[PDB]
Amino acid sequence: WXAXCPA
Amino acid sequence: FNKDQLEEFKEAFELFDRVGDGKILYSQCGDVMRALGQNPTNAEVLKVLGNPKSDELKSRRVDFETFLPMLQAVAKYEDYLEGFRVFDGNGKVMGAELRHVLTTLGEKMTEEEVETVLAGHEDSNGCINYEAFLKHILS
Amino acid sequence: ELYTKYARVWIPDPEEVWKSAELLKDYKPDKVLQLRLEKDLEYCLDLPPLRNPDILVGENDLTALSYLHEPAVLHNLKVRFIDSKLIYTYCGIVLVAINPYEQLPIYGEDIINAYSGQNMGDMDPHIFAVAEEAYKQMARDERNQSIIVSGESGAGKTVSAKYAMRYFATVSANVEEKVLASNPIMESIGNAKTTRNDNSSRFGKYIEIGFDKRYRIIGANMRTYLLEKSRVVFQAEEERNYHIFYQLCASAALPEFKTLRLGNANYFHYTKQGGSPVIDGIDDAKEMVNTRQACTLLGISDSYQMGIFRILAGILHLGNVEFASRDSDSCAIPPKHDPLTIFCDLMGVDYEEMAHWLCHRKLATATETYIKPISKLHAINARDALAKHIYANLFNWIVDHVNKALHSTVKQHSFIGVLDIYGFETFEINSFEQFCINYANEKLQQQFNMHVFKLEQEEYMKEQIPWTLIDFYDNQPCINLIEAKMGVLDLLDEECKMPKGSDDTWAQKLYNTHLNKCALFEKPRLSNKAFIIKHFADKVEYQCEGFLEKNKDTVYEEQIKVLKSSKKFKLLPELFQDSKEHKKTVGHQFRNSLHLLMETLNATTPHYVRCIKPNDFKFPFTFDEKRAVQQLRACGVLETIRISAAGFPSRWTYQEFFSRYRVLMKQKDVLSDRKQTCKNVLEKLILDKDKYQFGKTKIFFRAGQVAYLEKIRADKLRAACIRIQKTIRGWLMRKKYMRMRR
Amino acid sequence: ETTALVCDNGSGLVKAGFAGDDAPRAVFPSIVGRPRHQGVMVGMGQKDSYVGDEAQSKRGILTLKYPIEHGIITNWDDMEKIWHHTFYNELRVAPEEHPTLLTEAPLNPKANREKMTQIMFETFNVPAMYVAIQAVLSLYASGRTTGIVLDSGDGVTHNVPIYEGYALPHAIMRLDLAGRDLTDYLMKILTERGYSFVTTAEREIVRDIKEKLCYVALDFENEMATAASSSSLEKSYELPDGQVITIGNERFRCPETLFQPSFIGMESAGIHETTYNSIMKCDIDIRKDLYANNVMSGGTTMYPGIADRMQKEITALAPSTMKIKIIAPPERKYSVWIGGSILASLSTFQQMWITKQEYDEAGPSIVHRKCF
Ligand SMILES: Nc1ncnc2c1ncn2[C@@H]1O[C@H](COP(=O)(O)OP(=O)(O)NP(=O)(O)O)[C@@H](O)[C@H]1O
Ligand SMILES: Nc1ncnc2c1ncn2[C@@H]1O[C@H](COP(=O)(O)OP(=O)(O)O)[C@@H](O)[C@H]1O
Ligand SMILES: [Mg+2]
């Protein structure tokens, strides 16, 4: 993603 | 009308009086007007009579004195020719066609009236010289 | 004004759609009118149509009338039919033709020779005048020619085409008999009892007569269009299925049809639903003999005839296959099921391959395929779509065998082709069938109005009058309502795909899309299930309630592929012999077939015939003034006449005009130049050129003006006549006065 | 005439085809390989990168990237290669001639739509396009206007309730659990039985083991007692080199982590209890109908027994007096494509497309206001 997760 | 005219008209009127009471019927009034040289239409005659009903037109009687104002009121060539030229262009008119139109259009006449007026004026082909017939009926 | 003492009017009445009345006393521009009949009436307004002057009635041309409106047309046809016993009448380009229900001498070959090679105006109207004037066009133009015949079944269309063909055979063969011999089979497969009529033809039928460069008859091709496939599986009350199923059920006692295990006409679900298996006025048992005899005259072998009846009994049995819904999402066939057992025995397919495929559908994917179940509605829909697909292929096959019989080997140089098609249709209840039939009639009436406008532009150039005064009244907006995308058919094909589509949500899509966006779509005041379309002929109301179960064809390829496998008999695979089409709806198949038809007619410059059925009980030479007014509306003749009421319907040669109206001329005007004389006279008499055009050879009048001339002519003639007769009667009374003196 | 393309980017499989087809005809894994070894032979035609089934064939020598992780496109240059491969090589169709319909999971970044539109219009010059929510298409695919769609493929899981064609955007749930993370767990439990798969080529082997052998236990605790107390449950599989491997309780134990995400270490409840917690966010009038239709979609819902396990424990959570009905057609792996196939072939949909004019006029922002 961009924050709370890797993608 | 002068006194002489009134006397001649009264004498003529009395000749048409077939009952002796000095009167004619309303239905004879038109005939008397035509006999005195007027050529009123049936519509004009009924109009000057006051649009009488059948019963009084055929049986109500008026003397000469009451008839006279009506004759006065009714009394007061190129068109006739053009009218005949309507039915023409060799200057003739079929006797059959004039008979048909006079007995079937307008103020329709009887075949006997038409035969009477047309007698001697049509030739062997059945053609009417309308200038001569017109002069004849205008004479 | 136009009303006076001695004027006549048409007024509406119960017994006959208009009655004559006279104006008992002249109208004045008040709410009240004094009327005389045939007596006493007083009538009001909140104007009555005027009557035509009495020379022009019965002219054998309806556009020559100087007032053009429903009661003048009706009166002209009524007098020509009853008094003259003339049954053909020109209206504009059209030949209106009235079924006498009685034979007439006039078709004999001497009269053919009389019509032969003469132009239409030279001779009184007759069907031969149309055939002739096609023939000379085919020669002169080097372009194919068409003849188009419209009207209710029973109106004579088949016999009008018959004589139109006999004309060609006599001017230029075996075709006439060989074609005539086709009619009993194509009636049997293609005609139905309908609530208003028996033997309504449910398809377009097109014959092509081929000619060599020597224009002698080669032979004939036959084509068909617009077949009403929905009828095979569903009927409204007091309708039958196509005749052949009943003729076949009546035959069931005969020795061959024993093999079929046919029941009675109300045992099969496709026959049962109508309510009304037996037509009185027919026996179906006989008609089968006519059908088989015409098969044999057309050389369908006694083997193939029994094949055909095998297939038809197959369809009838197929409809009795009765799924049990076993779950909400799944259905099955209850074991050892007798309708299916008999269908398989009839067809050779294995019992269980069908029993499986009727209830399941299959999906193909790369490396993968799924069999999956279907719900009982979808099973019943797919079964019915199979029955429709069999029937439509069978019908196309039989037509292609008749074409084998009728073709002749020498190449067609050019052809004359004759289209029998159903006219515009309306019943109290209107449904997807009538929606198709009326949309087709809208397309034809477009192509007619286009061709008539072209011919007007030509005749105007022939007289060198500006085109500008013509206008082209164009039904195209109604076609773009019905057929175009975001149209009634397009939203109907949409509501098939949509999940939980229904007629109730289809209606709401109609009202949302069109209700006040278009001038021609209207909602019926008190209902939300129905809708209204203003067609060219009339406003018509359709119910939504049926259309979706009628529009749904889709056929699962597996069930066809099961039938294709069967090798008990040859006809069955032979039908299929020639992928997107399996997913088309009925409305889309119709819209395609109508384009094939219009592609055919647009090539081929048409001539038109309209057949009307003047009385309901087939009494010979009787006429009924409300029955005809219906059919003359449904044929669009009355709109065509209104269209010609706009424009300049009355056309006079200067010679005829001068001859008729010398009485209006005065000789001070009249010249050695007749045409200038007439121009001057008309410039006196009517104070608008706007009401008429002068041309090279003709005077074109706007609709009323000739009746105005006839009025002023009659009034002038009457005035002169009165003056003559009064003058004579005066002279005769002077003479009778001399008689009185005597 | 002209027919819309319908394309689903998914994660893992791409599946693509024409509107009104029965099923997709392009299907291939959305995977991009690059060669990582030193190339010895001079002239064998070596490419820079392989795409789809070509990379699946040669994967011995390749690193494999998945360009989509949890429905987000993480790598855009490698995504353009997959679309390029779909239109030119797999469907063999010029993309200018055809409107395209594209599929996306809800509640994901808006830059994903801005970019996906910018690429569609500017590189392909596709004349018109649309982007559709994956869950919504499953109802078109199954013939319903009402239901709660539970959809899980690779990557994202989501629930979307729909009541007669109205979405309920406050009640949408999304979960990152499904599909890939099941595999990354299964590798660790297999390591517990002494087999070790350490590389992306080996991951595809494990993913095939998962597809063949895993199944969902109706009662998890009894089956772990069964496997511990018995041999009967244990089943053996053959690696591509002909070694054979034997897998017991691990095969049911792997898809159990859908119902108890604590195993991998997430906080959230399993799919049954985000389904129930989704229905509870809807107003009381409609729960009667959402309980009556539950639609399962995408391939991670195809483990044997998952439908029963769902119906059983939701019937444990729900009030006692209701039909709980789980609708799981065998076709369901393709439902989001079949639904897009229907949607693109409606007539009413023809106004809906973003058309190239409107992107030229208003730029990528337009996607948000026209599309859902
Ligand atoms: N011009 C005509 N001359 C003679 N009889 C005619 C004519 N037009 C129709 N008929 C009669 O119409 C009757 C029934 O209609 P028919 O002529 O058979 O047309 P049809 O075969 O029913 N074609 P269709 O209108 O589709 O039903 C026949 O008995 C004919 O005698
Ligand atoms: N028969 C099966 N049983 C269990 N899991 C499967 C099966 N087939 C595919 N899968 C898994 O489902 C995932 C693909 O789901 P899919 O709907 O194709 O995802 P997407 O919609 O993102 O393409 C893959 O991880 C695949 O391993
Ligand atoms: Mg017929």
Ligand SMILES: [Mg+2]
């Ligand atoms: Mg007949």
Ligand SMILES: [Mg+2]
């Ligand atoms: Mg998916």
